[PDB]
From a paper:
Here, we report cryo-EM structures of human H1-containing tetranucleosome arrays with four physiologically relevant NRLs. The structures show a zig-zag arrangement of nucleosomes, with nucleosomes 1 and 3 forming a stack. H1 binding to stacked nucleosomes depends on the NRL, whereas H1 always binds to the non-stacked nucleosomes 2 and 4. H1 contacts DNA with L1, the amino-terminal part of α2 together with L3, and α3 to stabilize the nucleosome and contribute to chromatin compaction.
Numbering used by the authors:
A (entry chain m), F (entry chain q): 10 to 118
B (entry chain p), G (entry chain l): 20 to 102
C (entry chain o), H (entry chain k): 37 to 133
D (entry chain n), E (entry chain r): 30 to 124
């Protein structure tokens, strides 16, 4: 006699699993009680940052004519964006390289 | 069984390759051994806590997840090795 | 006369090439030799994920690269282009190290 | 067989096809993404944990999470994230 | 009616009289000491919570703190703290 | 009828309230259970660090010939211990001041 | 009530006193305004987050414990203000 | 003649004096006014605990004198005794700000 079970992700119309992340919050030893809308909100903003970084990385990969994302364009996306770079200044990337940065004083006459 | 000199396996072409990727143009001859010592210090700083991790994880095999912890408690957060 | 480039220009090309490229620049087998050399000083007969050593490498030369841009900034800021160890010492102090 | 290992690769790949229907992914980049999202998840949840300590509150609400978003995010990221999460909260409230 | 607030300044004072019976202290210095106690407490507690979260541990024992302090403390301080806490926990265990 | 109330700190021979420590752990939500020796070990290493830093403060105060220790004595105690400076480099101290440190290049001749 | 020009509420001789405490011997005239900008950036950051605290605390008065939070979230940790 | 100490003697004396002293150097009232001014940029109707204000003053002064010592050693490396804000910008950027 139970109604059809929607997902809370479908109730928010979103991609990320609300049950998984809410379970992570409950077993994270963070609080005994967690409100209903907070994991939904967290999944939404994780979706926002994910789409933002992924879109910029896809644009950067399109700049160098490859349709499969590599850590180099991940580094290019994260370091050329001052909010993203400031957000992750203490963050290391594997095989992302660095931004090509040449001092003009090193350049010859 | 023991290991005695692999720090001189750090080739000065590799050091100058990192210098070029680090943007260094002209390099003194005295740089190499001092940077070797500095990076070695960094290595004990990481691997001491990594050894402590593997000991507390009750293993004799070093895994990358403990490496993730060992980099991250100094805030050297590396992505792609956690999981 | 045989071809020979003036100094620094090939170094500039190396800088450009290596700033595009992302691969490891040390031969890795001496790097695991160093890893096991330092590791046995805390506890002997520790085994290693190869991925663990690769993470150690990526973090290591990443820290060295950032140190190298800081060292280059120090070398320029004292009105020069050539690095000396006093750049490294100043960088270590100002990094809180 | 082996135990199930949960991944965001399906969900992030869905988001990928939302924003870039054209491009593929590497497994290394996806491990980078998973390490990323787990890192920032425990970040934001940690500052929310300290907020729960400082507010002496047992139950975590969205209000505390929006506050922690202003703590973490740089600027227009924070305002847009607040906006998007606000709309998502509204349609979740109306299910 | 005033709300009783927990502070360690009496314990700091008795520790001081243990090490130096002849020595006094200012109130702001005791505030610094209580801040130090709370600071090291929250550091070690968050670190132990994370180490429990890694090895799927739900019960915290002194082994985990011993590991976490020998992480956080370099040099001889780690060895001496491990030794002293070992004697304290051991003769507590006999008690 | 019931045994004498006997403190766990006295049982561990300690000064810091291990019951208060364990309670703050439980309200700190670090784990859903905590072993008995954990807050004892916590308390004990806190008297260890406290004894060390107060030893240093006493050394500074006898060097500074004042009976009651002040935050300047705290600063002077801690900042000549470079091991603490690895431990507490990112720590600021109220009214502690700074180490008197004049470089030889500032000195003439 | 309404305040405009507390950018110069830091006097130059106060900066010279700080620089003598900071071990500085010879001070350019260009120093003071650049340091003014730097300190403005730092206080805008920490006081913005303090405002975020106090509105989250639903208060019209700030506390020093909010300041403790503001110093701790980059690890500029200060003792003796209710911590 | 009336006496005049040569440059650097008096400056080093005040360096000794203020490395000896511990107290705040900027006047508290204009700093407080600046605190109120900056906090007004975010939200009106705000009161201020004084303990918060002295905490801000002490933390700010400690931050400043720390970066002062950093730029001091940087100018020492740069063979100068006169500080210029290019040293400050280099110290911030290498420090990461």
């Amino acid at each position: 006699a139970r109604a059809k079970a929607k997902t809370r992700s479908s109730r928010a119309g979103l991609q990320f699993p609300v049950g998984r992340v809410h379970r992570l919050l409950r077993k994270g030893n963070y609080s005994e009680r967690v409100g209903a809308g907070a994991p939904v909100y967290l999944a939404a903003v994780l979706e926002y940052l994910t789409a933002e970084i992924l879109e910029l990385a896809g644009n950067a990969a399109r700049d160098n004519k490859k349709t499969r994302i590599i850590p180099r364009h991940l580094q290019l996306a994260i370091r050329n964006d001052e909010e993203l770079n400031k957000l992750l200044g203490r963050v290391t990337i594997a095989q992302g390289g660095v931004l090509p940065n040449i001092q003009a004083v090193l350049l010859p006459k | 069984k023991v290991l005695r000199d692999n720090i001189q396996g750090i080739t000065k072409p590799a050091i100058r390759r990192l210098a070029r990727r680090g943007g260094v143009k002209r390099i003194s001859g005295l740089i190499y051994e001092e940077t070797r010592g500095v990076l070695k210090v960094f290595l004990e700083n990481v691997i001491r806590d990594a050894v402590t991790y593997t000991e507390h994880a009750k293993r004799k095999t070093v895994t990358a997840m403990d490496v993730v912890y060992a980099l991250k408690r100094q805030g050297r957060t590396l992505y792609g090795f956690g999981g | 006369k045989p071809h020979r480039y003036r100094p620094g220009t090939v170094a500039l090309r190396e800088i450009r090439r290596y700033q595009k490229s992302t691969e490891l620049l040390i031969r890795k087998l001496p790097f695991q030799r160093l890893v096991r050399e330092i590791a046995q000083d805390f506890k002997t007969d520790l085994r290693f994920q190869s991925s663990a050593v690769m993470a150690l490498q990526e973090a290591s030369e990443a820290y060295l690269v950032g140190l190298f841009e800081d060292t280059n900034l120090a070398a320029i800021h004292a009105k020069r282009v050539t690095i000396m160890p006093k750049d490294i010492q100043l960088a270590r102090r100002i990094r809180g190290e | 067989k082996r135990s199930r290992k949960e991944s965001y690769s399906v969900y992030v790949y869905k988001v990928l096809k939302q924003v870039h229907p054209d491009t593929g992914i590497s497994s290394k980049a996806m491990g980078i993404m998973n390490s990323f999202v787990n890192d920032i998840f425990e970040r934001i949840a940690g500052e929310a944990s300290r907020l729960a300590h400082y507010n002496k509150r047992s139950t975590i609400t969205s209000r505390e999470i929006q506050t922690a978003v202003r703590l973490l995010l740089p600027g227009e990221l924070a305002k847009h994230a607040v906006s998007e999460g606000t709309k998502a909260v509204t349609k979740y409230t109306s299910a």
